[PDB]
Design a binder for this molecule. Structure first.
Ligand SMILES: O=C(O)CNC(=O)C(=O)O
Ligand SMILES: [Mg+2]
Ligand code: NI
Ligand SMILES: [Zn+2]
Length: 331
């Protein structure tokens, strides 16, 4: 079995290997990459996402979100307070302000220490889930707006034709902006490209150990767990690496820098934080190996998780028994 310790693998495809996206995912899996839940892909030196980022300031962040924490430094939840619209240029100036800017630090490890010590005492503002793309239309390789769609994958594997669409989303971050512990909708893959700016630190639990994380989360968030049998689908709970180690949860960590891709694999729980002003693009995708995870994915039916239109079909076809309860939670 490849990668039996479930380490995060880093790949350096050549320009020729960068042509066929599906093939390369399957290659990474042949080497055991999925066992970690997360892999990094460094593009070939010849590749670029677009020519420059000099002209992005007029993108609108319609609903910036202030991430307000509750709990203790290593075990907390966050809620998202809506703020007034602002442009990417306005958001960048805010991120760089004395109130929000990255503190002085020695290296990524020092910054990570500072994040986990101090995160809860601040409320950073995040631009999330902004439909759109920063890839040039002429970028042919690893262009996250030109991937094969999940609806087409389901039709190819299973024969069923379904409604829905699959487009990318932009994220604008600042110091301490935080992504809570989660798997993807329907335990899909994700891919994330860091277009510009400061790094993103990731934490990940191997898919084969995801239920260990779920059991700790039910212990640490006991009211949330009583409220919903899949409350991590609410994407609000944080647990620090120190707490994970104290509780024997297997995990790994890595820092993504600008110009790098990260792939998350089905049922790979992940969480993390941004180091400073940045812009990322991400989208969910599927492969044939996803189908069995889609069929088994947990679902939130309490009403909290509310998700895209296109997830309807996935539940309807892959999880017909669950469909009525889950759709009630959507309505
Ligand atoms: O940019 C982000 O925070 C969101 N990314 C992830 O949780 C991911 O790509 O799966
Ligand atoms: Mg612009
Ligand atoms: Ni994710
Ligand atoms: Zn729920």
């Amino acid at each position: 079995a490849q990668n039996p310790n479930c380490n995060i693998m880093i790949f350096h495809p050549t320009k020729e290997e960068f042509n066929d996206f599906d093939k390369y995912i399957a290659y990474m899996e042949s080497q055991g990459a999925h066992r970690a839940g997360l892999a990094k892909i460094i593009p070939p030196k010849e590749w670029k996402a677009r020519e420059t980022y000099d002209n992005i300031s007029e993108i609108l962040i319609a609903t910036p979100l202030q991430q307000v924490a509750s709990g203790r430094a290593g075990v907390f939840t966050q809620y998202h307070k809506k703020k007034k619209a602002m442009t990417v240029g306005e958001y960048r100036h805010l991120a760089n302000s004395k109130k929000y800017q990255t503190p002085p630090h020695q290296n990524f490890e020092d910054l990570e220490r500072k994040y986990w010590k101090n995160r809860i005492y601040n409320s950073p503002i995040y631009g999330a889930d902004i439909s759109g793309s920063l890839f040039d239309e002429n970028t042919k390789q690893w262009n996250l707006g030109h991937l094969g769609t999940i609806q087409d994958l389901l039709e190819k594997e299973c024969g069923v034709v379904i409604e829905g669409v699959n487009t990318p989303y932009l994220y604008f971050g600042m110091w301490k902006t935080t992504f809570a512990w989660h798997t993807e909708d329907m335990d899909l893959y994700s891919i994330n490209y860091l277009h510009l700016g400061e790094p993103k630190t990731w934490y990940v639990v191997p898919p084969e150990h995801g239920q260990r994380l779920e059991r700790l989360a039910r212990e640490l968030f006991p009211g949330s767990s009583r409220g919903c049998g899949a409350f991590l689908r609410h994407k609000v709970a944080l647990i620090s690496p120190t707490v994970l180690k104290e509780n024997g949860i297997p995990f790994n960590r890595i820092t993504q820098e600008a110009g790098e891709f990260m792939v998350t694999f089905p049922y790979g729980y992940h969480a993390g934080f941004n180091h400073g002003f940045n812009c990322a693009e991400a989208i969910n995708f599927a492969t044939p190996r996803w189908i069995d995870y889609g069929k088994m994915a947990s679902q939130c039916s309490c009403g909290e998780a509310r998700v895209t239109f296109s997830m309807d079909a996935f539940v309807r076809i892959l999880q017909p028994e669950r469909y009525d309860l889950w759709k009630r939670g959507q309505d």
